[PDB]
Amino acid sequence: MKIATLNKGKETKYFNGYPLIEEEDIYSQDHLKEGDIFQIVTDKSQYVATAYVGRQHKGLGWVLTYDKAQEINTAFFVKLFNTALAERDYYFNIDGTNAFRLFNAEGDGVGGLTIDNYDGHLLIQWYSKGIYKFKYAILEAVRKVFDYKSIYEKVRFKDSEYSGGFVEGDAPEFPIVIEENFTFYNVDLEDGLMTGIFLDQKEVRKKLRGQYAKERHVLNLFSYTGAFSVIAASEASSTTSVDLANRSRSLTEENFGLNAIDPKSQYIYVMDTFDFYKYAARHGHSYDTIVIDPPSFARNKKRTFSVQKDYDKLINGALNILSSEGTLLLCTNASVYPLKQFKNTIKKTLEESGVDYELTEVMGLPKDFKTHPHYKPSKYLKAVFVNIRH
Numbered sequence: 001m002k003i004a005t006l007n008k009g010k011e012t013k014y015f016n017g018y019p020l021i022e023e024e025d026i027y028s029q030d031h032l033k034e035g036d037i038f039q040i041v042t043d044k045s046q047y048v049a050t051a052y053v054g055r056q057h058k059g060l061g062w063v064l065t066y067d068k069a070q071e072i073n074t075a076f077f078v079k080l081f082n083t084a085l086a087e088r089d090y091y092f093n094i095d096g097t098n099a100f101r102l103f104n105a106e107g108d109g110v111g112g113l114t115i116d117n118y119d120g121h122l123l124i125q126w127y128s129k130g131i132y133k134f135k136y137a138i139l140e141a142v143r144k145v146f147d148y149k150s151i152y153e154k155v156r157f158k159d160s161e162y163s164g165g166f167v168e169g170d171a172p173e174f175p176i177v178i179e180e181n182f183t184f185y186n187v188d189l190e191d192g193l194m195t196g197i198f199l200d201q202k203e204v205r206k207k208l209r210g211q212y213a214k215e216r217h218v219l220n221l222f223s224y225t226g227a228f229s230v231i232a233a234s235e236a237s238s239t240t241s242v243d244l245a246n247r248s249r250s251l252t253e254e255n256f257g258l259n260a261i262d263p264k265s266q267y268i269y270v271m272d273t274f275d276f277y278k279y280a281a282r283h284g285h286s287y288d289t290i291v292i293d294p295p296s297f298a299r300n301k302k303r304t305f306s307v308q309k310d311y312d313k314l315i316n317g318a319l320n321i322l323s324s325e326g327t328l329l330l331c332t333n334a335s336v337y338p339l340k341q342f343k344n345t346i347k348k349t350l351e352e353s354g355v356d357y358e359l360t361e362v363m364g365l366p367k368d369f370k371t372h373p374h375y376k377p378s379k380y381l382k383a384v385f386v387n388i389r390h
């Protein structure tokens, strides 16, 4: 019923499957409000696609269907969910992992919607008021497609007093313990934005232990809950974790504890990564593997970090405490920060330092985090293993 018209010469990407309706690409007189279903049409009134309104950035909403006759109802989501579920048969068949993503937004057909499986406890995240409107229809479909002990939610958009919490089912006591790569972690689906682990780094964590941990001093910067450290510690001589947040210490200790690792056999520091570079370098400390996985942006009073602008500083600091033979695991999650450009920054920085280097591995989102083949920013994870000689 409601219509948005494409600007001339902007049709083609949309005809070819581009899922994000860009504000700059369309105009409408139909008063598009969050929640609204609308059709995109060319200047010559050809139907292009059906989308829903959910603004983020320069974005109006997301394409949902190319079938004019398809109504956006429970049966609609039931179909996407079954397809999403079927594409994850591997995660149901593997030992050692009971937590993974079931539905990854636009990669699975609905931008702004994610569903995670934390050992039977589902976490649904909504990235706009727009997609929230469909909560009832979506929940009915969840009930029709998925098995679960409970359902939690989080609202991942501004100006909502309600933040999320328990939805239905049998509520557990948090933290609950999940398993991934035969490694145990605490999770809390009801406390602040983050759950205690980032599932998208499942395979990166595996590789770190498998290939870059044995008998090494492993440094983990911006450690959060110490997940990288926890898994690497079964192989490393010892790990060192560094995070600015007070909580990180006890949370990290506890994760070590779940895996039969004495926290006292590991090093855990609460401080700014950049301060740690100094302290480590002043005490002549060296590490064989340095994991760097910072937030895209962070602020500490006056002090700010931007992944875009400050990554060279991260690399130079690590190098000054990396062993002659050593590996850097350089990661980001910033969708705005494309792999090409990330690799460029890494290369430039390393070339400037005069060290010998080799990008040995480049990893992206795992399969449970299905990306969209016509939307490049969906591929937001970059993890680059770099072997160093200096």
Ligand SMILES: Nc1ncnc2c1ncn2[C@@H]1O[C@H](CSCC[C@H](N)C(=O)O)[C@@H](O)[C@H]1O
Pocket (backbone or CB within 6 Å): 197, 198, 201, 221, 222, 223, 224, 225, 226, 227, 228, 242, 243, 244, 245, 248, 271, 272, 273, 274, 293, 294, 295, 298, 300, 305
């Ligand atoms: N300047 C800084 N120095 C060290 N840690 C920082 C920091 N600024 C933010 N952090 C921490 O970085 C974390 C962002 S989350 C990082 C997740 C982590 N890489 C993992 O593998 O799970 C937060 O815990 C935050 O406390």
